[PDB]
From a paper:
ASFV is the only member of the family Asfarviridae that belongs to the group of nucleocytoplasmic large DNA viruses (NCLDVs). The outmost protein shell of the virion is an icosahedral capsid mainly assembled by the viral gene [name] encoded protein [name]. The major capsid protein (MCP) [name] is the most dominant structural component of the virion and constitutes about ~31%–33% of the total mass of the virion, making it one of the major antigens detected in infected pigs. Here we report the chaperon-aided folding of [name] and the cryo-electron microscopy (cryo-EM) structure of [name] at a resolution of 2.67 Å.
Author numbering:
A (entry chain B), B (entry chain C), C (entry chain A): 71 to 248, 304 to 419, 435 to 598, 606 to 634
The structure:
Amino acid sequence: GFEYNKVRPHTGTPTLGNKLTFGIPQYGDFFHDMVGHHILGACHSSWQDAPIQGTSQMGAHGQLQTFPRNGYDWDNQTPLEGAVYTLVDPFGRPIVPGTKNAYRNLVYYCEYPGERLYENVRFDVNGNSLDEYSSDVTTLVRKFCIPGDKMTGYKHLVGQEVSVEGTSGPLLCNIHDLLDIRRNVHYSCNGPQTPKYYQPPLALWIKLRFWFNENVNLAIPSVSIPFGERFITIKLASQKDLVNEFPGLFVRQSRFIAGRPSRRNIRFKPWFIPGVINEISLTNNELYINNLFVLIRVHKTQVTHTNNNHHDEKLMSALKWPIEYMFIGLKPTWNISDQNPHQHRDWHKFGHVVNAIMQPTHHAEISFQDRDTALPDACSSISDISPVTYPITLPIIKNISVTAHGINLIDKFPSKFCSSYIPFHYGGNAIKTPDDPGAMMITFALKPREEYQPSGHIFYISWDTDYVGSITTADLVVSASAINFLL
Amino acid sequence: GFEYNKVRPHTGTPTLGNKLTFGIPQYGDFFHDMVGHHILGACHSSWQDAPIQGTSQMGAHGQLQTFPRNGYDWDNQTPLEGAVYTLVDPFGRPIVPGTKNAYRNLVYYCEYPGERLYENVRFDVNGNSLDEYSSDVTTLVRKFCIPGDKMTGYKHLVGQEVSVEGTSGPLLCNIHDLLDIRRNVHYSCNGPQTPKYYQPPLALWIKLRFWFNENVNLAIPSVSIPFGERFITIKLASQKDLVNEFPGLFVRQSRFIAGRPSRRNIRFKPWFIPGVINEISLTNNELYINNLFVLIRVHKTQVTHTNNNHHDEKLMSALKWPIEYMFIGLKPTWNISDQNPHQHRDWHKFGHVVNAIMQPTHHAEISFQDRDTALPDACSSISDISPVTYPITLPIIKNISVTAHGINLIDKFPSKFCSSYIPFHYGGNAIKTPDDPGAMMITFALKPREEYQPSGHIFYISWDTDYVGSITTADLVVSASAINFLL
Amino acid sequence: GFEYNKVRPHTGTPTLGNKLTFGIPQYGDFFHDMVGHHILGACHSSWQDAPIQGTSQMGAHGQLQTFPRNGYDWDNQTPLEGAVYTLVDPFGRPIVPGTKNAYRNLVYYCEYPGERLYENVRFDVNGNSLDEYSSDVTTLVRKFCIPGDKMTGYKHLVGQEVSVEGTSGPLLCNIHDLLDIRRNVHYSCNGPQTPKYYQPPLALWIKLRFWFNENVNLAIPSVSIPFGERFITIKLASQKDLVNEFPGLFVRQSRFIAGRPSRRNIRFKPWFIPGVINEISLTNNELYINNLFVLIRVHKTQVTHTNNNHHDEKLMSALKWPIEYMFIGLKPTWNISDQNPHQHRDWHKFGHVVNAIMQPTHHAEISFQDRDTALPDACSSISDISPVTYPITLPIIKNISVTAHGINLIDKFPSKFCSSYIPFHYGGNAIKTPDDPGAMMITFALKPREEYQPSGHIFYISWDTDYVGSITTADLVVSASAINFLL
């Protein structure tokens, strides 16, 4: 019936940042689904030296890193009485400053690195690119198309970590009604997105998304066009777009405040100087093709730059054929910028991402005069070394409209109508409601993907905004489910 | 094919607690699905005064609030040696008692406020209410009918908050087998159910649930009956059923216990005097109707009061047509009572809700004599200001039976057979197993909603109970999927 | 149309560890689905005596339990200066050693005890076992077949606890962009897997899995074979395979380390001597049969022992008919061993399970004096009594192959291709991707369970491994969806 075969690359020695070519062989009558398999090599950063006290130095992202003298604030000029500074590692072990080869930075991967690895995919027959897509289309259609019963396998395929459940012991935890033992549940991550001293090799399986990769009845015949000209070209992402560093050194500030009660504060600040990650190798580069032994839906994509104030119209130039539905996302440029220290986390998000920061502290309160006992004698406040960060994604688009030749066809729907209500009502089991508030769905059929036969089809797109200005530019990603004909 | 149109209300200036009328216009050939859009205005509470020490006052829900003198317990009569009382805000900042306009209460919304806003919905043609439902039917059919891939969009539509994931830094966390870096996962909420000083305006999208709102093939024609008489009447909930207060003042008790070791306890108690929330405005009241350009299933509902001991029978008077399946829920009256301080959380639950309370405390232990060193010198125990509350829902019904004209047809199934096994086996993808243990499903067809054609159809309902008495009365909500005929 | 009837057992007084027989009566024309209902009685452990100081004793799983003298380490020989040992219960209350009937162990159930209760199920007609399965097949097909919208009802049916959400009060939690109130979310368990002093009676509903229990169109007729010979035989699990103990006594070590600063450590160690759990009773043993009033797919299973190095081949002897797909799992023997203290948790897992252990400690730092103030005067470090345990499951099989008569048909796919990609691409809504990395799916049809008609069918199974040796043996569980014919 069918069999999976491995194909080696036609290029030879693929590298991060360059192109990669596969040639489809002559094995079966049909072939429908293809998957790419790569293994990214192990990663670590270089050894660095601990600084002397009262030293400075330029760090990551154009930010000053400083190790102040005793008796001063975080800046080395302004005095702060009773301040002592030491050096720790990210887990609290001392460092003894001035030591050469003292510490090492930690390394981690981007979120969903298998979706970021294939930066551009195109399919050629004597030139003549029959289909072509990028990674923004992949991240936009994951949020609508992958069901949720398939999500934990997809995260294993693209190299995204999953949280693991753990339990504590029993507790007392009384019941009030207007006693019973009870157990806490905790969650913990361990994968490639967790900063480690050494990352293990990472196996990535990337599903190819063409029109014949979807169904078995739309598989192209192997002898209808010869095997000597069918190629698949993939432009890969660079190493700097895949791996990132975490600071391996922290400055610990202990401060005594005299008085009643005497307070003792402990705070932490990262010392982040960028090192050199070793160059990642690519081994076991393979393409698994499912050969079969015995109209079409072309995903049409377009990305456009936007920098105007308060409202914008863009005409859809590349869209040609009749369209059943489309997915629209406005992604800020700063989400994929190298000046963003949260590019590793926000590259696939379609809104403005802010960060809530919780700094949990331990507090203690000791009294010993034995006779005063109104106010205590000593207070202790100790912070954790790194805080807890919560990403909050806010939508960019306030109102949206999609206009035809002359008529309006949508008169300024609010963005929650297209982000929440249209995926809730339309689609059935094939479309889920996304967690991202910036991903929107526009429908033109009453049953978009519950069935395979067109139930309706079909050019400006206009929107209002508060975010976009001259420096806060954005990109508009449009992925439309068109209909074409193959012969 | 189809187009969404907005309809303004026929009433003019809608208010919370009153009725609201929409008139269906003459635009298309058919219309099937409708959604109501409202925006609830911003909310805050009034400024209040800090009390003097030793003062009392009647608080929230008929409960005494007291600020005791130094040297006494929480009651102002019984003496407790070494007790000092101060006033803090909910985040630990001092208040300086006697100050006028010192603090302000916090405000929040009920759980799922979009489901509670439409208290009653009916559909009129020259009078003659063709369909009518309430909010208990909506909360009962959400727990069975909304799939789960659609749940995070539905919560955005009805104004229910979602938790946001955050991560910490790396940790040590050794491995035992019979070392590796690791990261904690935390969750945090931010929405309208979180108590804040100022609630932002809340946009609500409420889907209307009639028989023609379900399918496109059952859309009623626009010219078959004229547009001059079709009305939709909605009775809205009041403001006191939507917003609630959280105490903005706490009394902090610091207690020194002399001895070996000397202990220092810090506890907290809320000072909760109700204020005046400003009156909520309703703007942008709209009805979005999907007009189409070119037998039935009527949900039949009934609610009945119940107050008998140990067992009860109720005859189903309103049920007329043949019934494919039904959903049954016994909801206690105290879940929707105004004397319940947890009405904001328990109004949509179909069981007895108790509260587990965890009070997490920080403990510290200091020894200094340097020569005794067996037992410490000082202990510190500091509580958090507000505890962690876990709602536990317990079922009311022990055994259930549904009897026909003369025969029994169900002979005392235990309630877990109808709450868990019947939604697990029957329904397919259209029915999920609910988290609420008081929501039960009775089937009469072998395939209830996998298909659209009747596979079986069809009156007392009897049950055993331990909860229901004279003062712990309850309501029986029945939502049945009947079959009628439209012409 | 249909009606559920209860059938009492034919055995009389069933016990844990023995067999149980049901006889199918003569009530309807057809019958398709059956469910078994049992109630396991209440559980507690015996009263034990607190040991004297300096005493030892052989504890649980061949491990020495010791209560050391003051001034020594955990071993009673090596000296440790400034160590004091006391006895606490699991919640921190003192015990006063030497007391007779001082404490009691805690009891809990295995994970998914309803899946472990039916250790073997077979269906007899005059002898002649038409179908037969074990509990490993049930745990293997739960991970693929139960959807996820049905999972919380299934966990209520088989007696597995669910976590309950709770919230804290509001917090400060400033926002950084490159202030707003916020609430924490916590989770907590309360069910039969939580160690308690007294376990309540546990009601178990176990669905029977035969070919006629799946569909209504494949229901066997009641008069086609007589009611006098159809039997269902169930071998039940023993009590030692169902309930387990948790230690009710801990040794608390308080240690003073003199110096600058003076440190005070508090650690805990369990004193675990096994007691006698009372014998569990079985009441309300019933079989609910759905009688109907007016080709086949036989699950073919095989388990084989394996102990070879680095690679293995096993021939599939029992597999006869054409096979649409199969599920394969390699489960270590130590997962079901009685020498494993984590048998209660790992019996249903198909990999090597290691344990990460987090020991959260409270730390405090006090400085009196007032003139030195560089380094503190006293440090406090207090542990929790029991730590937080995270199970990590690692796969045993590295590469897998399934060979036909002469040809290879699979040439060493890596195990993530069969654990993740094949459930992701094939199956549709009927197959989900499992969380267990050792459960693998092999397909032979292009649409395994999206439809009911065979879309392809069909013997060695070989694999590479790093885990399996002479003492780390394993079992191979194969559950295949064959096709047979009934007449």
